[PDB]
Amino acid sequence: MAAVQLSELRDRQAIFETLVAKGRELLACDRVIVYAFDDNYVGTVVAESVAEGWPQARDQVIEDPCFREHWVEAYRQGRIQATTDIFKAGLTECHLNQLRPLKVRANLVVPMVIDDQLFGLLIAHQASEPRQWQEIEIDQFSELASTGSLVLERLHFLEQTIASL
C-alpha cells in the first residue's frame, strides 16, 4: 500500500516541492523559496513555500536578474553567501524595495550546479526574525541543494535524450 497517486508521482514540481519541504525542516526556518535562472535571467518560479500566517510570495516574480556585473561567477565556483540582513548590503541601491514586501528578514543562499553548470539556488528567508546560520546547518543545507543536481542530472539528460529518440 502506498496510494496509487504516490506511485504515479512523476511531476517535475513534486521533486522540487520536496527539496523546499525538507529545507524548512532542515534549516528549521520560517519561510523558504526556490528560484532558478532560466534563459531570461529571471528567477524561475520553481516552488514557493511559506509558513502559516505569511502569504504566498509565488505571486511575485523576481524581476531583478542580478546578472549585471559579476555575480553568476560567484556561484559558479560554489561560493557561500550568508547575509544576516540584506538591509546592510548594497545600500542606496535596489534591494529593500523588492525585498521589503516578501518580509524577508534573513537571507541565506547556497550554490547548486549541474555538470559544472549553473542551474539554480536554494534560498531560506526567515520572516519572523534574522537568524545566524549554523556552520553545520549551512553544510547540510548546501547538501540538500547539491542533491537536486543528482536528480536533475538524470532527468535533465534522460528527459532531453527521450525527445531525441
Ligand X SMILES: *[C@@H](C)C1=C(C)C(=O)N[C@@H]1Cc1[nH]c(/C=C2N=C(/C=C3\NC(=O)C(CC)=C3C)C(C)=C\2CCC(=O)O)c(CCC(=O)O)c1C
CB-nearer residue toward ligand X: 69 or 73: 69
User: Quick check: 108 and 141 in contact, CB under 8 A?
Assistant: yes
CB-nearer residue toward ligand X: 22 or 95: 95
| Subset of 44-63 contacting ligand X (CB under 6 A) | 62
What is the Cα–Cα distance from 131 to 125, expressed in whole angstroms? 9
Q: Is 59 annotated as a binding residue?
A: no
Residue 3: all three cell numbers together: 496510494
* Closest C-alpha to 109, from 78, 130, 88, 63: 78
State the number of binding residues for ligand X (CB under 6 A).
19
Q: Is 129 annotated as a binding residue?
A: no
DSSP 8-state secondary structure symbol assigned to residue 118 = E
Site string for ligand X, 82-121 (x = CB under 6 A): -x--x--xx--xxx-----------x-x------------
Q: Is 70 annotated as a binding residue?
A: yes
In angstroms, the Cα distances linking 114 to 2, 64, 161 are 31, 23, 16
* Closest C-alpha to 36, from 116, 163, 133, 145: 145
Could you say which of 14, 21, 28, 66 contacts ligand X (CB under 6 A)?
A: 66
Q: Which spans of this chain sit near ligand X (rule: CB under 6 A)?
A: 35, 43, 62, 64, 66, 68-69, 71, 81, 83, 86, 89-90, 93-95, 107, 109, 123
